[PDB]
Amino acid sequence: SDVFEFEFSETPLLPSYNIQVSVAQGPRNWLLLSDVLKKLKMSSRIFRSNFPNVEIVTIAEAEFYRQVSASLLFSSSKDLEAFNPESKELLDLVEFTNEIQTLLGSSVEWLHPSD
Template sequence: MATEKDHFLFEFSADPLLPCYHVQVSLSQFCNWFLLSDVLKRLKMSARIFRARYPQFEVASVPHAELRRQVAVSQVTPVPRGLLRGEGEEEDMEGPVELVRCVPDLQGLLGSTVQILEEERS
C-alpha cells in the first residue's frame, strides 16, 4: 500500500527573510526564486563576483512585466509595492529581471537554516 507524505518546510534566520517568488521562468521550471538584486545586497557583492564564486546557483532572466503579472496573480506571495509600481526609470521596468533559484544551499549562504518535517499518512 502506497502512502502519501506531507512535508512542512520551516526556514529560520536571524535576519529578515528575503522575499521569495513562486513563478514560472520556463515551461519546466515553476519554482521559488529570489531577485538577484536582493541576494547581491544581502551578500554585499557584485553580480560578476557572485556568478564567479557560485556558478552552481541557477540564474534566470524574465521580463519585468511577466514577473509582475505572475506575482500579481499569486495566492501565496503578496506583491511588493516596488515590484508593481517599479523602482527607478520607466525603461528599467520593461527590461529583464534576474532571478536566482531558491535552493537550500543558497538559503544557507544567506544565513537561513531549513528544517523539513515529514508526516506519513496511510
C-alpha cells in the first residue's frame, strides 16, 4: 500500500527539491525521484526493491521548472539547467512522508528535522 515507508524502515528522507505549493493551506513537497534515486546512485529498481513502501509520480518538466525558476529570485539553483519548459520529458516524484508533510507542511524544524 502507498504508506510511503513506515518511518521506521531504516529509510532516508534526504532534503528533496520542491517549491511553493499553497500558502493558504500550507507548503507541500513532492520529492523528485530523480533526486532520491541519484542519491542511491543505482537503478530505479533498487529504489522499489529497497523501499516497496513508496511509489512514483510525475508532473511535467515545465511544471517543476516553473515554480523553482520563479523561487530563484531569492535563492540560486543553477542545477535548473536540467529542467526546461521547452520540454516535457517528465520528472519523477515520490510522495513525502508524515514526518515530512509535518516537517515541511506544518513548517517545523527545531532540531535535525524529524517531524
